[PDB]
Swiss-Prot record, chains C, D:
Disulfide bond residue pairs: C6-C11
Gene that produces this protein: INS
Residues of the full protein shown: 90 to 110 of 110
Name by which UniProt lists this protein: Insulin A chain
Organism phylogeny: Eukaryota, Metazoa, Chordata, Craniata, Vertebrata
Amino acid sequence: FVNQHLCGSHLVEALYLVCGERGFFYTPKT
Amino acid sequence: FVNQHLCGSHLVEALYLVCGERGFFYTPKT
Amino acid sequence: GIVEQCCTSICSLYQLENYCN
Amino acid sequence: GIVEQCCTSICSLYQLENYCN
Ligand SMILES: [Cl-]
Ligand SMILES: [Cl-]
Ligand code: NA
Ligand SMILES: [Zn+2]
Ligand SMILES: [Zn+2]
């Protein structure tokens, strides 16, 4: 796995790319 | 056919932008 | 489905809020 | 929030797994 500060169209696709076949949630609200 | 693994990467990317700060929930079923 | 709405059909920015929180 | 987690700080292979439904 890559260890970075996840931001940008770099992390979202990772959260998706990692979580895979299950699902995910995004909270822009802090 | 049409491949969704790929379709999602664009969708989720774009969604981030569009949904903005209110955030979003990605369910890979529907 | 959402992947059903933009895959076989392209969608525009407004038409994406339908899936936004 | 969560940004403080992975974008504010570096995230690992599982800290996001907490964020899956
Ligand atoms: Cl960047
Ligand atoms: Cl593609
Ligand atoms: Na990209
Ligand atoms: Zn970038
Ligand atoms: Zn592509």
